[PDB]
Amino acid sequence: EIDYKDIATLKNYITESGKIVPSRITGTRAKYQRQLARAIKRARYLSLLPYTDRH
Amino acid sequence: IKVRENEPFDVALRRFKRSCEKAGVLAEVRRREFYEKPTTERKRAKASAVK
Amino acid sequence: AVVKCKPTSPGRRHVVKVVNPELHKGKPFAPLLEKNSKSGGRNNNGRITTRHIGGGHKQAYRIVDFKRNKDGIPAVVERLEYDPNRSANIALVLYKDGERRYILAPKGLKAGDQIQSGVDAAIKPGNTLPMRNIPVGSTVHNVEMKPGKGGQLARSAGTYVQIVARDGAYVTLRLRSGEMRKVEADCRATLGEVGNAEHMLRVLGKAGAARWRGVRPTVRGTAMNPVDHPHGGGEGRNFGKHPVTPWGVQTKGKKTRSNKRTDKFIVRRRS
Amino acid sequence: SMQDPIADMLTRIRNGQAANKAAVTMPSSKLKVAIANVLKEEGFIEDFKVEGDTKPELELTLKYFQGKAVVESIQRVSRPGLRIYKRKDELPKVMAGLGIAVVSTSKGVMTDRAARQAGLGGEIICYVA
Amino acid sequence: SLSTEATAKIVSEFGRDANDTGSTEVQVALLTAQINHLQGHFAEHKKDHHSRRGLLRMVSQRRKLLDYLKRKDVARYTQLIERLGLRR
Amino acid sequence: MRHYEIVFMVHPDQSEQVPGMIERYTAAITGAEGKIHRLEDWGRRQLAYPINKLHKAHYVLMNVEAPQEVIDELETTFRFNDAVIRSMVMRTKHAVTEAS
RNA sequence: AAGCUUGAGUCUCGUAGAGGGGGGUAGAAUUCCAGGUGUAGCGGUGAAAUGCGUAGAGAUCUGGAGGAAUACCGGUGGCGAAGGCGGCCCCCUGGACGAAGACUGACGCUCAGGUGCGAAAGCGUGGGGAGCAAACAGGAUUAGAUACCCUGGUAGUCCACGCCGUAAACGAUGUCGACUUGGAGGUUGUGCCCUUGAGGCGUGGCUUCCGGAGCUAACGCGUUAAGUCGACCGCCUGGGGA
RNA sequence: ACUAUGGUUUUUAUU
Structure with missing residues (x-):
């Protein structure tokens, strides 16, 4: 929430393939699933997360 | 899910077709709750005393 | 940008004109002019060497800088102007410590715009620097083959070339002709594209409006006597002959390069 | 939306008969109440009440007989x-x-x-x- | 929407009593402030669809109230064209 | 005034030209009654991918309150500096307190 | 007409949203371009040929441009006069809707004419052209191939401005509003409750299935009805000609 | 691999 300059907790909601984890395995409320899913994408533009996942 | 450990060889065998992804673990026969149990086991063990 | 003319007079319906609010329209800067003497397209013994050039009307020269005058020194654009002998037109620049000069226009529609020179230049369009300084993928115009009074390659309106590799004293680049060339890197090139790019949108509407600017219509070969042009037609205007020049040689697909010497710069020629 | 004060009155007296509902409610008006009094006087309903002040509500007690409704026409x-x-x-x-x-x-x-x-x-x- | 102050500059200044909106001209004046603010939506930009279509919707809404003012408000149209520049 | 985060990356071969821009625009914000709540160095990080022959970069975190037209005039100031790789302007979330 | 404030709309604080406009910007790969390493294959079908290459391709390094689009997020979860709409960031903004008060006083709803608008394709005058591709030029298949299949490729698809205005525009049901049946599921606000709840009880706002009255020639509709009713507007009298 | 077809037409009333 409000921050994407740290990712060490945010990575908990990402798969090993770099895609967003479905809320039904984390019990996360859908409003917060939406926020975390867009926050994971915001953190790619600060180069803290890759876009690929090609090797 | 993808390959993360091998290291000089892997189990392979129909890699992720009816193994490690969809039936078992969700879909078709809906058995053994492997999707919704592993966090409940990690919630309750824990040590829970004297290591 | 260009606009279409109204039918306020005969034939004018088809005319298109170029308009630029930043263009000066007044006279060129008087200390930077000469008359540019012409030899009329004939040698000292009165014989034709260049054709279709007779019937000219007065043109000057803006003392245009191709010699890379004041190298490594910054300047600023003061005004934009017209030049009858180059399709990109011209710009007037004022140099760091004094004086003006006219330069071949880099792409742009404004004045008050600064430029830099040499290896202290920024990687920005309009700046002029040795090709040994520019990175792979860069676009350039007026790129230079040798230092001197003149300047070579990519000068016609809207043209540029792009560099693909660099190794030692040379750089490899891709031409508008489809040629691939390996050129000397110490030579002074200008970043980006050469200006105007709208020169082939010109109409030359009135038949007298080509003549009043010194342009001559070329004389049709089939309309001549067969013993004065080998392409000359019969009384019934009949063709019946392969195309040729006024000097009897065939033109449709027939090659003419005969050099076998300029090998150093060759990689792969046009196709 | 609502053009006439009794276009929703007749349907609410005709409907609910198969489930034999002993009551029905509707929004109240001067003409609905003036009709409800004569429908009680002619024995087609057993009671009528008005409830409210600025937008009143009308409750009608519907009439039945052995295995049947009474208002059949x-x-x-x-x-x-x-x-x-x-x-x-x-x-x-x-x-x-x-x-x-x-x-x-x-x-x-x-x-x-x-x-x-x-x-x-x-x-x-x-x-x- | 219009600001609380640009609203107050009509509904607490233009009516016949303190905070009066029962003068029909105040319903025309508040819309004449909202339509001028919608003609203020532009710069930056010119070609916004929902504002060009919504501007014409505020013209429809002003033709509604101005026709009514010259129909059921007796004489108050000539007592309003001295206070609104409807002919610029 | 409006609140913004502003978190920027410095190019490792242009890096000496950043202080002549940012430590000089702090006057242009405070002259407009604006505030800069930290301007702290976040250090040299290894990147999650190579940005075309750039794989390790230095980060800075600003935190600002200003007029919107002073942050628009800061965007052209970051773009004319060219030693900075994205300003990363992001709206609202209020001002930082107690050093985050 | 003047008061009332039950129809309808609005402000303060608030809710969710791929609704619209104007500016910026990014990761990969197909491609193109130049040099290494090292060779004759690649490409493609039911099975092949035309072709790219052998004058140095495919593959793999090395070093960079060029173009269209935006993985996951994503849920019968949401929005929009209609058509339709999912990158991420900034600058503008309509509708719907929740709590508690204040306000206009019929301001609603319907609508001939008129003026409004696009999913694709096309036109004008120029730009830009990876992935694909009317027509075009080949090859194979064949009795022939204008079709399957395949190498290349123009207009087009992209962009600026002015035109074009259509459809199975079909969520085939013109519209505002009220009443009512058996059982579940999803989903956004606000009240009430020591949440004694590892969530209900009310009340607004939203919404998918499965039964059933009534309704149909039959499929279907089914409280978000094609059921029960009332007002405004619009349309209709056989096939083919056409 | 690997396909084109064939005009027109019929059979009781009666308790």
């Missing part, structure tokens, strides 16, 4: 966009003497029986038997 035989009017001598007969027509007279809501008793005509608003 109820129609308007007129429409708010194309109304029906009759002279004092021309008020409509229903089931050749076994039914009654309801008239809105210059002295209020009454049966054609009572309008002819007084020597009045008016607007025809319901047919019941």
Whole structure:
């Protein structure tokens, strides 16, 4: 929430393939699933997360 | 899910077709709750005393 | 940008004109002019060497800088102007410590715009620097083959070339002709594209409006006597002959390069 | 939306009969109450109540018999966009003497029986038997 | 929407009593402030669809109230064209 | 005034030209009654991918309150500096307190 | 007409949203371009040929441009006069809707004419052209191939401005509003409750299935009805000609 | 691999 300059907790909601984890395995409320899913994408533009996942 | 450990060889065998992804673990026969149990086991063990 | 003319007079319906609010329209800067003497397209013994050039009307020269005058020194654009002998037109620049000069226009529609020179230049369009300084993928115009009074390659309106590799004293680049060339890197090139790019949108509407600017219509070969042009037609205007020049040689697909010497710069020629 | 004060009254007296519902509610108006009094006087309903002040609500107690509803014939035989009017001598007969027509007279809501008793005509608003 | 102050500059200044909106001209004046603010939506930009279509919707809404003012408000149209520049 | 985060990356071969821009625009914000709540160095990080022959970069975190037209005039100031790789302007979330 | 404030709309604080406009910007790969390493294959179908290459391709390094689009997020979860709309960041903004008060006083709803608008394709005058591709030029298949299949490829698809205005525009049901049946599921606000709840009880706002009255020639509709009713507007009288 | 077809037409009333 409000921050994407740290990712060490945010990575908990990402798969090993770099895609967003479905809320039904984390019990996360859908409003917060939406926020975390867009926050994971915001953190790619600060180069803290890759876009690929090609090797 | 993808390959993360091998290291000089892997189990392979129909890699992720009816193994490690969809039936078992969700879909078709809906058995053994492997999707919704592993966090409940990690919630309750824990040590829970004297290591 | 260009606009279409109204039918306020005969034939004018088809005319298109170029308009630029930043263009000066007044006279060129008087200390930077000469008359540019012409030899009329004939040698000292009165014989034709260049054709279709007779019937000219007065043109000057803006003392245009191709010699890379004041190298490594910054300047600023003061005004934009017209030049009858180059399709990109011209710009007037004022140099760091004094004086003006006219330069071949880099792409742009404004004045008050600064430029830099040499290896202290920024990687920005309009700046002029040795090709040994520019990175792979860069676009350039007026790129230079040798230092001197003149300047070579990519000068016609809207043209540029792009560099693909660099190794030692040379750089490899891709031409508008489809040629691939390996050129000397110490030579002074200008970043980006050469200006105007709208020169082939010109109409030359009135038949007298080509003549009043010194342009001559070329004389049709089939309309001549067969013993004065080998392409000359019969009384019934009949063709019946392969195309040729006024000097009897065939033109449709027939090659003419005969050099076998300029090998150093060759990689792969046009196709 | 709501053009006439009784277009939602007749349907709510006709419907609910198969489930034998002993009551029905609707929004209340001067004409709905003036009709509810004559429907009690002619034995078609057993009670009517008004409840409210600025937008009142009307509850009707519906009438039943052994395994059956009692109001088995109820129609308007007129429409708010194309109304029906009759002279004092021309008020409509229903089931050749076994039914009654309801008239809105210059002295209020009454049966054609009572309008002819007084020597009045008016607007025809319901047919019941 | 219009600001609380640009609203107050009509509904607490233009009516016949303190905070009066029962003068029909105040319903025309508040819309004449909202339509001028919608003609203020532009710069930056010119070709916004929902503002060009919504501007014409505020013209429809002003033709509604101005026709009514010259129909059921007796004389108050000539007592309003001295206070609104409807002919610029 | 409006609140913004502003978190920027410095190019490792242009890096000496950043202080002549940012430590000089702090006057242009405070002259407009604006505030800069930290301007702290976040250090040299290894990147999650190579940005075309750039794989390790230095980060800075600003935190600002200003007029919107002073942050628009800061965007052209970051773009004319060219030693900075994205300003990363992001709206609202209120001002930082107690050093985050 | 003047008061009332039950129809309808609005402000303060608040809710969710791929609704619209104007500016910026990014990761990969197909492609194109130049040099290494090292060779004759690649490409493609039911099975093949035309072709790219052998004058140095495919593959793999090395070093960079060029173009269209935006993985996951994503849920019968949401929005929009209609058509339709999912990158991420900034600058503008309509509708719907929740709590508690204040306000206009019929301001609603319907609508001939008129003026409004696009999913694709096309036109004008120029730009830009990876992935694909009317027509075009080949090859194979064949009795022939204008079709399957395949190498290349123009207009087009992209962009600026002015035109074009259509459809199975079909969520085939013109519209505002009220009443009512058996059982579940999803989903956004606000009240009430020591949440004694590892969530209900009310009340607004939203919404998918499965039964059933009534309704149909039959499929279907089914409280978000094609059921029960009332007002405004619009349309209709056999096939083919056409 | 690997396909094109064939005009027109019929059979009781009666308790």
